Amino acid sequence: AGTILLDLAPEDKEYQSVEEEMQSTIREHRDGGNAGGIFNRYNVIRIQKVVNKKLRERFCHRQKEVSEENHNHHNERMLFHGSPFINAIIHKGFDERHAYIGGMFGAGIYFAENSSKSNQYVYGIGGGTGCPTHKDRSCYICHRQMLFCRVTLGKSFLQFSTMKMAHAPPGHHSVIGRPSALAYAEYVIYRGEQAYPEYLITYQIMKPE
Ligand SMILES: Cn1cc(-c2ccc(-c3nc4c(CO)cccc4c(=O)[nH]3)cc2)cn1
Ligand SMILES: [Zn+2]
């Protein structure tokens, strides 16, 4: 339950890399920016490493189970995640019982390779009502947050179109929605312990001008 957030220095290459994955994976979205807001760059305020003994225990236990079940290859990937429930994720860990039901691959926990895709879910599905303060889906004042996660993919099952499932197919540990049709790739897990909220990114979207 006890989380420790260690601040990474802007001069540390651990921090520089995380910002590089965030900034370099920004892509033009089909909604014209309705959910995330109009922007071309981020203003990264703080990058923190999330430390929780039990969450790391749950994840490492599962990683071992997935590894054994997939020829000793857990197939981990660092993907982004945006959710209005960041606080509960860093303290209580991801919970499949809070799976995005409305998803194209059903009730799973969704991650993106593109940071801009996760930014549309920072304030809820389709950006919700936006920032709690100024009710703006495009707010440039409020500090937003998202996670850059360690995700245990195991044997991924590739899909190209909407296929609703509750759990990953037999013999598989995850679903990947590939851009064929799809705008950007989306990664889906059906178990909370197959993701660890490694990095906590406090940032702002930048008003172009
Ligand atoms: C119960 N509840 C679940 C939610 C919530 C929270 C987060 C997401 C979510 N979805 C993503 C999708 C889905 O297309 C693709 C790619 C990335 C993401 C992502 O970072 N977060 C979805 C839903 C709200 N309330
Ligand atoms: Zn605001």
Swiss-Prot record:
Changing E186A: Loss of activity. Ubiquitous; highest levels in testis. Phosphorylated on serine residues by MAPK kinases upon insulin stimulation. Phosphorylated during mitosis. Ubiquitinated by RNF146 when auto-poly-ADP-ribosylated, leading to its degradation. Deubiquitinated by USP25; leading to stabilization. Zn(2+) binds at C131, H134, C139, C142. Residues 9-209 form the PARP catalytic domain. It is found in: Cytoplasm; Golgi apparatus membrane; Cytoplasm, Cytoskeleton, Microtubule organizing center, Centrosome; Nucleus, Nuclear pore complex. Poly-ADP-ribosyltransferase involved in various processes such as Wnt signaling pathway, telomere length and vesicle trafficking. Acts as an activator of the Wnt signaling pathway by mediating poly-ADP-ribosylation (PARsylation) of AXIN1 and AXIN2, 2 key components of the beta-catenin destruction complex: poly-ADP-ribosylated target proteins are recognized by RNF146, which mediates their ubiquitination and subsequent degradation. Also mediates PARsylation of BLZF1 and CASC3, followed by recruitment of RNF146 and subsequent ubiquitination. Belongs to the ARTD/PARP family. Oligomerizes and associates with TNKS2. Interacts with the cytoplasmic domain of LNPEP/Otase in SLC2A4/GLUT4-vesicles. Binds to the N-terminus of telomeric TERF1 via the ANK repeats. Found in a complex with POT1; TERF1 and TINF2. Interacts with AXIN1. Interacts with AXIN2. Interacts with BLZF1 and CASC3. Interacts with NUMA1. This is Poly [ADP-ribose] polymerase tankyrase-1. The lineage of its organism: Eukaryota, Metazoa, Chordata, Craniata, Vertebrata. The gene is TNKS. The chain holds residues 1105 to 1314 of 1327 of the full protein.
